Every structure is written in structure tokens, then in C-alpha cells.
RNA sequence: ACCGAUAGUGAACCAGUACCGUGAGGGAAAGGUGAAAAGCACCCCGGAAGGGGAGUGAAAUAGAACCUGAAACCGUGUGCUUACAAGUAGUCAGAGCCCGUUAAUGGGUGAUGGCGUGCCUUUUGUAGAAUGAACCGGCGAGUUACGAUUUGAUGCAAGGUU
RNA sequence: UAACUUGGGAGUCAGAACAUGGGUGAUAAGGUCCGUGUUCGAAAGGGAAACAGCCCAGACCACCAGCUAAGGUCCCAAAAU
RNA sequence: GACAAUGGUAGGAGAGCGUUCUAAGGGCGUUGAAGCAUGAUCGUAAGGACAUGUGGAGCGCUUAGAAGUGAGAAUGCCGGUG
């Protein structure tokens, strides 16, 4: 089966609006600086 | 008041004062111009001509005679290989009124 | 001498572009799109303005007809009324009339009942 | 364009109106009350904006009919489920709540504009003689021949 | 006759006539329809049947 | 004025680069930073480092204060493309196409 | 044209089952790099008129030039020079034939003068006669133009 | 009164060559920085690539994949607008909001109302569920030679013409 | 208010429905074959819900003027509750 | 100045627009040509100008002459991109 019509440029985007990415949880290091991913380790300092 | 003038092919209500457009009149720019078939007259003490109030006359003076911006004409049949395309500008008299039934 | 394409089609064509703006994506771009477009919209001003002439008696008649009820007269026998006491006054006015000065409106009337 | 007036949401008012509808046939009161909600009664109608007053019909319960229309009048409906032609109910159901019998008779004789679907919920039917609406103070309505 | 004011005969030399340049022009099928306006074109040099 | 910089032809597709880049459009660069090292996507590192130079000659060219500034504006475009084959049942071959983009970040401080 | 185009003559593909259009060459004019088709070959652009009507045209730019500025003079001098342009003392225009009786070479390299022309009678086209602007005959070749074309 | 890089040779470039076939054989694409290499010393981020300064230059918004740099196509910003509505997408009517012109009874957007089944071909008849076209660009079809005939024009004329 | 004569250039030789006089079929066909008329083909506009062939009527162009034809006049929807 | 006519497929007749080159005249051009872009410009149509940006060296106009002279469709050819 194929297409019988070709996608307009805005059926496309429209199809698109959820195909995001989320930003990362992320928390700051206790008095390390660089930020780690959440419940996840703190590494070397 | 009002006028209902008969001017172009048509009826116009004027008011005295404020300029109008109708179809053209071919007199000079400058010079002034009167309406003699004036069918109503409003306000106070109207007038109701039947048809045209008798001697009844809107004066005004003539302000621009230019041309309407022009409107392609364009048309034509499907699968019959014709078309037509004409430009038009109809052609105008700008004027403002001055006293009505003067 | 061997004549070259040139500026002339693109120009054309950019012409018939810049013609059909309001158009939606792909109907103000492409140029055969566009040409079609642009063609059918010329028809169908060109029938549209003649049209119009009719789309606006009606309009005035209906608000004639409005305020001819309102004096408990139908606007059948208002028109009737009027040609027969030789108004001859347009329907474009009649209405505007009845809009911005219901004193003259009512006079009119009178004289069309008078006269039936 | 040379001069033809064009009313709006700026230079319009709507009037609030009751309609006793006992004693009064279905449909003749329908298209009446239709033309009221249109402004078409009204020198100042204009076609692209609603100019149309507020109608209150009251005593729904007591709108008659010609005929045997309490029977052979059906009214149909469907699910758009197959067999779904839940349809039929006969027009003598008024006694099942008739503020819908006036409500859809009435709504049919507006245009199908989304306009005119808007211009259909200035409606307000009730088959009782009471109805909840005064504050918007409506003035009482004859209904013209 | 100064030579950048040449002008031919008032009545001599009508343009060429170009089919198959548009549909205003009024040739565009060129001429015929759908018969033997192939290009071969033979009707066989005077004849019928 | 306002600094930036930019990777040319880089190897990953626009459309791939430009998710990542939707995170980090408009933020405070420090926490652009983050979200770029901890964003896991392929092109997360090459636009860090994009980010990271830019900063860096926002200082040391135009002398702003690196910690006032913002990811004013931030983008990917189409570059060139390298185009490939790869071969298929019945001897057909057919098209791929090995994209690479543009990428561009200006960042800020006030108006003047 | 096609059967000129160093190529051709295998068909491209089989006519059908491809779900491509027919081709027969690769070397047809619908294809890039493909024959031309009429495009121009050699030929001669050379007519010939009535002679009454040379002789006719010769009269015409002759007396064309006679019935406004066509001028006449004593004759010829020495070996080569650019006192042609002072022989304007005489006060002929930018454009100008001499037209000497019969080739007199010398007069003939009072040539690069930045337009002027100068033959014998015997040629005398209509086209010199025509850019022309101001024409001047000696005596003898005027002489003989009268001869000639009477 | 031939071509000017899809043209003109197949070949303006180390072409009968990459490439393809066992072979005979088939047979491409690909020209342009600048006047001058003056082809970006040096500092900076980067492993590099690439970039920001600083410089060469009339110009590098001419930086080498380099003159001009169209369209399809991909993006970033936003002025008007859009989540009760059945749309060949426009056209006619029209409020609101924003703007200010090759100043003329101006420009952008558009709540809402009227009307409204693309184009081409081919057919008695096509919205057609009959054909063709993904889109944009370039290229792509009545010509020339000779003869015949007819019309117009010009010259002569009982002659005209080589 | 045309007609005919001579010459240059043509295209056409698949027709369609409706009405009507008829053959064929079954006083079947949106059938078929002839006669006559209209319309379509090549005809937009209005009516017949939509609807080449039916009814009214033949679009040089602009108007937010008027009278009409077929068909209409409670609401959708112009006009007689 | 009245008056009449002006739907149209195959098709006949007419008048014109624009493109490249040529001839002659007359001009513009680094104080910025062609080209490209944008615009609320003009003509009954094809089409013609003007201003601004870009561009960096060539080009109009008039009269005539000659044509590889005009593209949206060929399951057309090449290229780019969906
Ligand atoms: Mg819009
Ligand atoms: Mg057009
Ligand atoms: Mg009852
Ligand atoms: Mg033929
Ligand atoms: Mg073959
Ligand atoms: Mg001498
Ligand atoms: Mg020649
Ligand atoms: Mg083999
Ligand atoms: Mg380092
Ligand atoms: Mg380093
Ligand atoms: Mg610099
Ligand atoms: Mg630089
Ligand atoms: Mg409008
Ligand atoms: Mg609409
Ligand atoms: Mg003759
Ligand atoms: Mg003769
Ligand atoms: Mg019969
Ligand atoms: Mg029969
Ligand atoms: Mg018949
Ligand atoms: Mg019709
Ligand atoms: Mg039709
Ligand atoms: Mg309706
Ligand atoms: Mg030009
Ligand atoms: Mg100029
Ligand atoms: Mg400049
Ligand atoms: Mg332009
Ligand atoms: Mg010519
Ligand atoms: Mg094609
Ligand atoms: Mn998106
Ligand atoms: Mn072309
Ligand atoms: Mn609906
Ligand atoms: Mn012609
Ligand atoms: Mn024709
Ligand atoms: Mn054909
Ligand atoms: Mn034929
Ligand atoms: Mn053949
Ligand atoms: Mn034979
Ligand atoms: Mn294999
Ligand atoms: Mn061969
Ligand atoms: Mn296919
Ligand atoms: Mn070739
Ligand atoms: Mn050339
Ligand atoms: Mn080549
Ligand atoms: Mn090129
Ligand atoms: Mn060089
Ligand atoms: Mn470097
Ligand atoms: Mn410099
Ligand atoms: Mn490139
Ligand atoms: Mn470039
Ligand atoms: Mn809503
Ligand atoms: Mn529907
Ligand atoms: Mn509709
Ligand atoms: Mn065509
Ligand atoms: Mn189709
Ligand atoms: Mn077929
Ligand atoms: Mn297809
Ligand atoms: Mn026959
Ligand atoms: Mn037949
Ligand atoms: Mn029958
Ligand atoms: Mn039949
Ligand atoms: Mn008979
Ligand atoms: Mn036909
Ligand atoms: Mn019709
Ligand atoms: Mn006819
Ligand atoms: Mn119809
Ligand atoms: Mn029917
Ligand atoms: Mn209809
Ligand atoms: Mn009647
Ligand atoms: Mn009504
Ligand atoms: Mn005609
Ligand atoms: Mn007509
Ligand atoms: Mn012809
Ligand atoms: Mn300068
Ligand atoms: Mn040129
Ligand atoms: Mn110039
Ligand atoms: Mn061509
Ligand atoms: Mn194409
Ligand atoms: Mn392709």
C-alpha cells in the first residue's frame, strides 16, 4: 500500500506537534557543580 | 437633510457637505455643477416629489474627474481552449455638495 | 542565431504567482497551481460581480419590507401604493430612508396608502 | 459600494420576548417565532451578523396539531450503529418533554450557517406556564397572524 | 531613404503565419483533428478509392 | 555586540541536530549547558561544544561578562549532502542520503 | 540533426514493462544532448531583381543625394596622404563617398579617414550611395555616370 | 545577421577516458576566486573539522565546494488569526485589530453571510471512479531547398526576361 | 434582406436527448433504423432540490439603478400567512 | 453627433505583444550595465516603465532586416529537491 496523495507541508508539521524531546530531570550537585541526572550518582567530585 | 438626487443611472442621498462620486459629467475640474432632479427632501419640512420636488435643486462643486482603479475581466471554458482577458477603469466625477435645495 | 529562454518565462510566471496571495501554501507558490487558481478566481469574480447587483436588491427589499410591516402594510402593497401616487423613488433609498429618519419613512407611506 | 448601511455588534440591541404557544398550531407558530430569532423583522437585518431578538416560548406543553399527527407523524433519528434507526417516536409525544418538539420544529427553520446555529440558542422553550428567565425583564409577545 | 528610415512597399510583405505558438493564436492542434493530420499526411497525390 | 559562532557541515541530519536544539533555545547559558551534557541524543556534545566556543569569544573578543549571558538564538540548516546507494533484492539499487547541517548560536547580554 | 549525433541506434529499452515512457534513441531531440530538429543549415539568402529596376534604383539614390547635397570637383593630385582631411576644406560632412573616374589608387589610400569611401564609377552601389550622407563626383566619372545610366 | 557550457564536437576540463559488456560494442558527467596569491601573520574555543576577532583586498555578505546566485525544498523571529467545526480552498459582502504607499475613492490580516465539484486530453456526454502530470528549473514539435499555383507589391509593356 | 458566379484557405463523414409521423423489438429499453422541429454538441445566465439534451432566455465592459420571462410569494429563501 | 452590431469548438480572416541576432541613426553606463529581488505603477490584452537593495560591465531607444522567437501536460530528456 502506498500513499495516494502526497503530504502538504502542514499535515506533516501537524503530525509532528508531539515529536519532542523532554528536558532531562536534572539536579544540582551538593557543592560539586556540574548538575546530575535525578536519583541518580554524584560521580568522582 | 437628505436628497435623493438622480444623478448617474441611479438614486443618491446627499447630505450637503460631503463630497460624492458618481458617473461622469465631462465639466471642467473646477466648476460647479447642479443637480435638477431632486425626488425627496428630508429634515424637518420634507418634500416628497412625485417624482422630482418641483424646482427643488442640490448645487455642488466639482472636485476630480479621474478613473476607478482597473478590475481585470478575465474568463473561460474548460476543455474548450478559450479565454478572454480585459482590463477596465471606469471613469468618475468626485464632488462635494453645498447647499440643497439651492 | 539560436534564441535562449531568459527572464521572459520567469517572469511570466512570477507574475501569476504574485497574482494569487491570499492562497493557501502550495496555491501561492507553485506556478501551475497558482495559474489555476488565479484563473478560476477570475470567473468567479467575473460572475460574482454581476451576482452582487441581485445580492443587494434583495437585502433592500427585505428592509423595506421590515419596515413596512411595521405600519401593518406589506411591502407588496407598499411598492403598489407608491407607483400609483408615481413615487418612483428607489429601493436603496427607500430603505435608507426608513434607517435614518422614520418621520419621512412614515410620510411615505402615507402617501402610499392614499392613492389605494 | 456606494451606500448601504450595515449594522453590528456595536450599533444592535436584542429585545427579550415571551410567546404563549396554547391555542397556537405547531407550525405556524414555528416560522413565525423562526423569523423572529432571524431579525428579519427589523429594518436594520443585515445578513452576515445576528441581529435577532431573544424568544421565550411558554406553555409548550399545550401546542396542537391538524390531522391524526399524534399518530402518523413520526419523527425518526439515527444511531449510525446498523439497525440504528432508534427513530421513531410519534409527534403525540409532546407529553415526553415538548420543550424539544418546539425546540428541533423551530430549529429547522433556521438555516444550517453556523451563524444560524447560534442564532437558534436565543430559544428557550418551557411546557410549563412559569419560566426561570425574568432579570432579562422580556416584554409579552402577540403572535400575528 | 536615409537608411535608418527604411520602409517597404505600402502594400508589399504580410508576416508569416506561425501555428502551433498558443491557443490565441488560433492554431495549436496546428490544423485538423485525428485523421490524417499524421504527419506522413498522404492523401495519395490526387485520388480516392 | 552580541556574540556567536558556527559549526559548518557537520555530519548529522537537521532534523536530528534541531530536537536537541529546541532545549536549549532561549535559556540562561549555564543551565543550556546542563541540559546539553545530560540531553543523551548524538548531537548533544557536537552542540556543546558549539555553544562553548561561542561563550568563549564572547569573552575574550567582546569582553562581556560570561555569566550575564543568555542563548539568544539558536539553529540548524541544511548543508550539503553526501549521497550514497545501497543495493537490494532483484539487483535494484536505491537512494540514501548521508545529510549534514549548519549549526549556529549567538548569545547575549542587554541592548547595549 | 538526430542521424548526425555521434550515437544512437540502440533502443534505450524495451518498449513495454518498464513503466517508462517509449524512447528509440538516445540521441532524439526531446533528450539533452539529442539531434535538433530544423534548426538552420547553409544556403544562399541571394535573389535576383529586374535590371530596369537597378538601373532604376541608382537613378533614385543618385538623384536622392542631387535633390538634397550632392557635390562636384576639379580632380586628383600626388601619392598618399592625410591632406584628404584637409581637402575638407572643401566642407564635406562625416559621411562621404569620392567617386573617381576609374580606380585612382592613391586617392583609393586616402582611406582610413574614419568614414569615407571612395570607389570608381563603375561600381557605385546603391548601399555607399545610400549611408552616403554627402556624395561628391569628380567631372569625368560624373561624366560617365551620365553615360552609363541614361 | 553560426554555438556560448543541458549550447557548440561524444569530448572548451590528461574522452573514446570513469563506467558497462566474454566479446563485437556502448559511452558519460565535469568550464569561471582576484587586477594582482596579495590564498587570512597573530590571539582565541576545538583532538580535528569548523568558527569569532585581528588583518590582505575596491569588494571575502569575492575565503577556495570561491562571479552573479532564481525556483522547488529546509529553517528562526513575529503582526493579524485559529481548538462547536463538513472545506476543489477561491470569489462577492463585511466588522474588528495592525500599518502608512510608485497618495489613490491606500496596504496586511479576516469573526461572520452569499456563491462555488482543478487543469489537459478525449468524447454524444467527464467533478469524473476515463488519460496525463510528485514539485521546481532548464531543454523539448510546420522548417529549409527546389519546383507548381494563387494573391499582394514593383518595373517595364506587344512585349517581358536572362 | 439577402441570393448566385468564379477563385485562395478550410474543418466535418462516432453524434445526443426531447417532441412528433413511422419501421424493427414485445404499442420492452437511457434500444434500434428513417421523416420533421428544437436544444446540446460549440451556450454562460434564470427555473426544474442536485441534474449536457427539459422550460424561460442568447453574457462587449463597469453600476450597491429600473421593468419583466419561465417559475414563484408561512420559515430555510426574494416576494400574498 | 445620433444609430447598429460584438456567446462560441474544428476552422478561415485581421491587428498586435515580447525574445535573440543584424543594419543605420541617436543614446545610457564604475557618479554602477545586464541579471536577481521587493513595491500600493501604467496600457483594452500580450506586455511597458519608475524607485530602492543586490550586483560588478556591459546595455537600451528609433526604423528596417532575419529567425534555433514564446511551454504546463508528450508513463517526454537531464538536473535539483520533496
Ligand atoms: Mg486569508
Ligand atoms: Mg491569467
Ligand atoms: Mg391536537
Ligand atoms: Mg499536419
Ligand atoms: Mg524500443
Ligand atoms: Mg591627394
Ligand atoms: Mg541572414
Ligand atoms: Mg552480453
Ligand atoms: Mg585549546
Ligand atoms: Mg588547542
Ligand atoms: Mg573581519
Ligand atoms: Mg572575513
Ligand atoms: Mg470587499
Ligand atoms: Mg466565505
Ligand atoms: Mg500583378
Ligand atoms: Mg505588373
Ligand atoms: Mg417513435
Ligand atoms: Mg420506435
Ligand atoms: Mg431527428
Ligand atoms: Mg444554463
Ligand atoms: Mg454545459
Ligand atoms: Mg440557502
Ligand atoms: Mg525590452
Ligand atoms: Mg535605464
Ligand atoms: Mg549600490
Ligand atoms: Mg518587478
Ligand atoms: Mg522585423
Ligand atoms: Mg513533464
Ligand atoms: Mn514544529
Ligand atoms: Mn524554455
Ligand atoms: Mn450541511
Ligand atoms: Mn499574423
Ligand atoms: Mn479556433
Ligand atoms: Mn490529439
Ligand atoms: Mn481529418
Ligand atoms: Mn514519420
Ligand atoms: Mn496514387
Ligand atoms: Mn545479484
Ligand atoms: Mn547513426
Ligand atoms: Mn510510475
Ligand atoms: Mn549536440
Ligand atoms: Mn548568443
Ligand atoms: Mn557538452
Ligand atoms: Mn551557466
Ligand atoms: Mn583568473
Ligand atoms: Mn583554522
Ligand atoms: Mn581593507
Ligand atoms: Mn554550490
Ligand atoms: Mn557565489
Ligand atoms: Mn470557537
Ligand atoms: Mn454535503
Ligand atoms: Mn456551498
Ligand atoms: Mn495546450
Ligand atoms: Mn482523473
Ligand atoms: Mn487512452
Ligand atoms: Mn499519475
Ligand atoms: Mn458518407
Ligand atoms: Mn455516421
Ligand atoms: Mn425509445
Ligand atoms: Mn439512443
Ligand atoms: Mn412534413
Ligand atoms: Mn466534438
Ligand atoms: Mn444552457
Ligand atoms: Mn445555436
Ligand atoms: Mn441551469
Ligand atoms: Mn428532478
Ligand atoms: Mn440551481
Ligand atoms: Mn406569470
Ligand atoms: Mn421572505
Ligand atoms: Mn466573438
Ligand atoms: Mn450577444
Ligand atoms: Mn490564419
Ligand atoms: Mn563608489
Ligand atoms: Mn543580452
Ligand atoms: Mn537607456
Ligand atoms: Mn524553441
Ligand atoms: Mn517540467
Ligand atoms: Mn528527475
Given at each position: 500500500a502506498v500513499p495516494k496523495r502526497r503530504t502538504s507541508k502542514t499535515r506533516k508539521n501537524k503530525r509532528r506537534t508531539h515529536f519532542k524531546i523532554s528536558v532531562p530531570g536534572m539536579t544540582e550537585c551538593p557543592n560539586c557543580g556540574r548538575e546530575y541526572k535525578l536519583s541518580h550518582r554524584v560521580c568522582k567530585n | 437633510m437628505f436628497a435623493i438626487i438622480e444623478t448617474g443611472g441611479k438614486q443618491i442621498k446627499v447630505e450637503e457637505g460631503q463630497e460624492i462620486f458618481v458617473e461622469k459629467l465631462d465639466v471642467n475640474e473646477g466648476d460647479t455643477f447642479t443637480f435638477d432632479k431632486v425626488l425627496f427632501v428630508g429634515g424637518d419640512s420634507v418634500k416628497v416629489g412625485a417624482p422630482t420636488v418641483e424646482g427643488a435643486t442640490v448645487t455642488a462643486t466639482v472636485n476630480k474627474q479621474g478613473r476607478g482603479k482597473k478590475i481585470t475581466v478575465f474568463t473561460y471554458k474548460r476543455r474548450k481552449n478559450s479565454k478572454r482577458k480585459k482590463g477596465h477603469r471606469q471613469p468618475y466625477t468626485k464632488l462635494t455638495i453645498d447647499k440643497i435645495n439651492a | 542565431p539560436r534564441v535562449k529562454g531568459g527572464t521572459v518565462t520567469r517572469a511570466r510566471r512570477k507574475k501569476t504567482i504574485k497574482l494569487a496571495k491570499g492562497y493557501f501554501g502550495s496555491k501561492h507558490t507553485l506556478y501551475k497551481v497558482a495559474k489555476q487558481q488565479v484563473m478560476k478566481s477570475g470567473q468567479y469574480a467575473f460572475r460574482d460581480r454581476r451576482q452582487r447587483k441581485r445580492d443587494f436588491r434583495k437585502l433592500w427589499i427585505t428592509r423595506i419590507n421590515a419596515a413596512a410591516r411595521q405600519h401593518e402594510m406589506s411591502y407588496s402593497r407598499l411598492m403598489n401604493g407608491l407607483k400609483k401616487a408615481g413615487i418612483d423613488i428607489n429601493r436603496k433609498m427607500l430603505s435608507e430612508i426608513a434607517i435614518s429618519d422614520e418621520k419621512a419613512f412614515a410620510q411615505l407611506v402615507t402617501k402610499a396608502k392614499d392613492a389605494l | 459600494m456606494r451606500q448601504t448601511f450595515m449594522a453590528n455588534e456595536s450599533n444592535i440591541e436584542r429585545k427579550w420576548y415571551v410567546i404563549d404557544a396554547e391555542g397556537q398550531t405547531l407550525g405556524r407558530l414555528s416560522s413565525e417565532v423562526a423569523s423572529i430569532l432571524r431579525g428579519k423583522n427589523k429594518v436594520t437585518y443585515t445578513p452576515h451578523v445576528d441581529t435577532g431578538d431573544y424568544v421565550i416560548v411558554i406553555n409548550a406543553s399545550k401546542i396542537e396539531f391538524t390531522g391524526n399527527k399524534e399518530t402518523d407523524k413520526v419523527y425518526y433519528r439515527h444511531?449510525?450503529?446498523?439497525?440504528?434507526?432508534?427513530?421513531?417516536?410519534?409527534?403525540?409525544?409532546?407529553?415526553?418533554?415538548?420543550?424539544?418538539?418546539?425546540?428541533?420544529?423551530?430549529?429547522?427553520?433556521?438555516?444550517?450557517?453556523?451563524?444560524?446555529?447560534?442564532?437558534?440558542?436565543?430559544?428557550?422553550?418551557?411546557?410549563?406556564?412559569?419560566?426561570?428567565?425574568?432579570?432579562?425583564?422580556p416584554e409579552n409577545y402577540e403572535l400575528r397572524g | 531613404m536615409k537608411l535608418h528610415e527604411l520602409k517597404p512597399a505600402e502594400g508589399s510583405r504580410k508576416e508569416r503565419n506561425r501555428v502551433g505558438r498558443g491557443v490565441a493564436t488560433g492554431n495549436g492542434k496546428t490544423s485538423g483533428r485525428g485523421h490524417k493530420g499524421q504527419k506522413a499526411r498522404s492523401g495519395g497525390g490526387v485520388r480516392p478509392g | 555586540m552580541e556574540a556567536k559562532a558556527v559549526a559548518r557541515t557537520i555530519r548529522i541530519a537537521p532534523r536530528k541536530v534541531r530536537l536537541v536544539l529546541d532545549l536549549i533555545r532561549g535559556k540562561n547559558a549555564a543551565e543550556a549547558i546542563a541540559i546539553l551534557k545530560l540531553t543523551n541524543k548524538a548531537s548533544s556534545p557536537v552542540i556543546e561544544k558549539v555553544l562553548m566556543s561561542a561563550l568563549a569569544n564572547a569573552e575574550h573578543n567582546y569582553d562581556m561578562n560570561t555569566d550575564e549571558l543568555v542563548v539568544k538564538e539558536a539553529y540548524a540548516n541544511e548543508g550539503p549532502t553526501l549521497k550514497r546507494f545501497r543495493p537490494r533484492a532483484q539487483g535494484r539499487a536505491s537512494a540514501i542520503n548521508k545529510r549534514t547541517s549548519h549549526i549556529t548560536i549567538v548569545v547575549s547580554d542587554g541592548k547595549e | 540533426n538526430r542521424s548526425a549525433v555521434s550515437g544512437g541506434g540502440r533502443k534505450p529499452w524495451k518498449q513495454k514493462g518498464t513503466g517508462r515512457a517509449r524512447q528509440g534513441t538516445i540521441r532524439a531531440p526531446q533528450w539533452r544532448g539529442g539531434g535538433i530538429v530544423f534548426g538552420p543549415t547553409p544556403r544562399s539568402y541571394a535573389y535576383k531583381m529586374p535590371k530596369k529596376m537597378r538601373r532604376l534604383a541608382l537613378r533614385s539614390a543618385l538623384?536622392?543625394?542631387?535633390?538634397?547635397?550632392?557635390?562636384?570637383?576639379?580632380?586628383?593630385?600626388?601619392?598618399?596622404?592625410?591632406?584628404?582631411?584637409?581637402?575638407?576644406?572643401?566642407?564635406?560632412?562625416?559621411?562621404?563617398?569620392?567617386?573617381?573616374?576609374?580606380?585612382?589608387?592613391?586617392?583609393?589610400?586616402?582611406?582610413?579617414?574614419?568614414?569615407?569611401?571612395?570607389?570608381?564609377?563603375?561600381?557605385?552601389?546603391?548601399?555607399?550611395?545610400?549611408?552616403?550622407?554627402?556624395?561628391?563626383?569628380?567631372?569625368?566619372?560624373?561624366?560617365?555616370?551620365?553615360?552609363?545610366?541614361?
Open positions: - | - | - | 444511531s449510525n450503529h446498523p439497525g440504528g434507526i432508534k427513530s421513531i417516536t410519534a409527534g403525540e409525544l409532546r407529553r415526553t418533554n415538548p420543550e424539544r418538539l418546539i425546540e428541533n420544529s423551530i430549529k429547522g427553520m433556521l438555516p444550517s450557517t453556523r451563524l444560524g446555529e447560534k442564532q437558534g440558542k436565543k430559544l428557550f422553550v418551557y411546557g410549563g406556564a412559569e419560566h426561570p428567565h425574568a432579570a432579562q425583564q | - | - | 538623384s536622392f543625394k542631387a535633390q538634397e547635397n550632392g557635390l562636384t570637383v576639379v580632380d586628383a593630385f600626388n601619392f598618399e596622404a592625410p591632406k584628404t582631411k584637409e581637402f575638407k576644406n572643401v566642407l564635406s560632412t562625416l559621411e562621404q563617398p569620392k567617386k573617381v573616374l576609374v580606380v585612382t589608387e592613391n586617392e583609393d589610400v586616402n582611406v582610413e579617414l574614419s568614414a569615407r569611401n571612395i570607389p570608381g564609377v563603375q561600381v557605385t552601389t546603391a548601399q555607399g550611395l545610400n549611408v552616403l550622407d554627402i556624395t561628391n563626383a569628380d567631372s569625368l566619372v560624373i561624366t560617365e555616370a551620365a553615360a552609363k545610366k541614361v
